[model samples]
Target: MVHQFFRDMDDEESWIKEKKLLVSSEDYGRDLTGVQNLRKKHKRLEAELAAHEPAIQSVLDTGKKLSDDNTIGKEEIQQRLAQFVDHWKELKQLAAARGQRLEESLEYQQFVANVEEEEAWINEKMTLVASEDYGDTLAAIQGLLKKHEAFETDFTVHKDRVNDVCANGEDLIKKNNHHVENITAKMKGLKGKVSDLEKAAAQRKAKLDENSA
Candidate 1:
């Protein structure tokens, strides 16, 4: 089967973001270490894809040209390439659907907005506390102190929950990495196969020239 190369790459990209969110959610303590690990994996996958892309494109282009010229195996080549292109398009649609679902979900939208507003309020409160003059105002100072303490308590509770989520998400991140590794291995194999075919084609043409000479 022809690989859904583009679609698989797109899925990998989306998975990276999904996994990052799971690790970095405010509810779960935004694990920087998890984020870094995932980022490194993402970078490697992208680099691998980029490295193979030109060669893949060349194969597809050659196959199309050969098919147009009605060369031997033209139909088979075209059929395989068509299957890959069709599957890639389907995967693209699936990715778009997933993106739309996330963007259009009311709960997700509200949660994102709430996080933004909450962070803004936290910043504003911190600024107020920093600039306030509590000279000879024991009640005001005590009130501010209590508010600050409450904020710390809330933050700690949320951070604890985040830590738990991050712990649970580690397995999922590992699974995704495995998927990426499998895809990368398959892509490398495809590149090798293409190289072998090119070499065979070159040797055949060289033999034909020697026979004619």
Candidate 2:
């Protein structure tokens, strides 16, 4: 929505931070769809932010603008430009890195989604088991009981997908790009998610089996 602004070129961190595009672990996303939406919307922000390039250079490149009370005296302007230039360089590096980080979080969020997908699917089925077959007939109970026994087989695709995610995650850890420690720890957390899923699934299955017997 924020398309153009003349005065903003003078501002720095607050401008970028206020936009919330710089990237923070907290604001990443809850699931795959959330991040996918975030990525799409954030890209639009990128385009608008890029529009600042010309405005930034114009005042610096044209001494005439800054010379004739270009809102400030030349000596002061000259001194300010150097400091701003260095900050500009540093900000550019991290701005690009923000894109790098966005892509990384996009990838990371996929793994989180993987767990959520599998977790929720299992959770829904767990609901059936938890129903304890309630007042359903033995045949009805057995129907789901049979299905529950094969649940692990039905879920193999998620299993393999998570396996590869964690597998690739270990490899990414080796390369150790950008934020290494966080990457390593998150990979571990994903594995933790699956292990818990397995535990809950098995618990549900055990009750399902005995109830069938």
Candidate 3:
């Protein structure tokens, strides 16, 4: 099965190095190291989210196993629950970091920060999936999936906005570079004109002095 989402990401990473260099370079005039840092941070976060996806599914499956509220082995359930909790914590932290980065970006307003709510809801769903009640757990998982889809939409919109900002910043820097080149050309032209005027004035002065002598 071709997962188009993950498939395109492979090609997407090739530009990170270039973007990071631009951010660090004097061309942009500031250490936009934060942008690169955020890229790495978000990449790690997406990876963590992917890694725990199976565990999330497993827990949801176990929860679905409940019928009439029958007791399963508490020890095994506890182990799975602990694992889910641990992964959830890490996932939440990564997500929070991503949200913080986005909030700090000029392109993204604080309102866009609400996307972090989707992450929190996902974490809540994971917690619910570990519950002993199969019916409730299944319901929670379904709700999580819906929110996940919504998050995907929001993430796509925000990602495009980020890319646009980066492109615009590059364009601005290039324009400034062009302006500097023009100024330098004009300065050189002025220097040449001044040198010619000085030489002509000196020649005139020497002739007058010679005639007077």
Candidate 4:
């Protein structure tokens, strides 16, 4: 019976160690890596947007001027320009939210690490239980069970938050990537249109000069 009791206690202790290791290594490790990846993607997208800003602004400014001068299709051009501006504003807000989530993920890693450390200490008490009288062992088992229950409660609460951070971050990153592709394609089309407009303006200027001469 004593041998059976020792076997059970050993099994419980092993299970706790395994759970703690899984939390520290697998769960925390995965989330930390995910946050870091999202962070990198956010920064890259931000820089790309920054580099394109001047060109984008120039297009908007010229489109506005042409609209004011009553150029052909000016209203349509102005509407499209407005849409691009709105997209940029939305992307900027998304980037900021992504950055905040990344920071939160980092904080959560530390919190999980602390919890794992506490559980490790609690698991150590199992050795004492093994060397004690039947009454003492029962008391220790009860105490350990309570600690495990409390830790489980804490784990469930915090783990859900961690999952949320990861999910939201992933969703934002995918959204940002999709929008960036759209904006890039739109910008390319706009550039072609701008070049055509410039060429037409040059041709008109040359014809007028010849007639005036």
Q: Pick the candidate with the highest TM-score.
A: 2
Among these predictions, the greatest lDDT belongs to 2
Deviation (Å) of 189 in candidate 4: 58
Deviation in Å, model 2, residue 84 alpha carbon: 3.0
What's the candidate order when arranged by decreasing lDDT?
2, 4, 1, 3
User: What tens-digit string does per-residue lDDT give for candidate 3 at 5-86?
Assistant: 2233222323333333333322211224545466566567566556755655554455434322454554554554455446
lDDT by residue for model 2 (1-213), tens: 011222444564356455544533345556667777777866776676688667667645653355555553557666666765666566566556666666677776675565566567656754554554422566776777677667677766667776786776666666557456765676676667667667777777677666667
Q: In candidate 4, how many clashes are counted?
A: 0
Residues 62-134, candidate 1: write the lDDT tens digits.
6666667887666676776676556444544444444433333322233333334444544554454444343
Pick the winner on TM-score between candidates 3 and 4.
Answer: 4
Span of ten consecutive residues with least summed lDDT in model 2: 1-10
lDDT, candidate 3, equals 0.43
TM-score of candidate 3 relative to the true fold? 0.27
Off by over 4 Å in 4: 1-29, 125-213
TM-score of 2: 0.51
Candidate 4 global CA lDDT score:
0.49
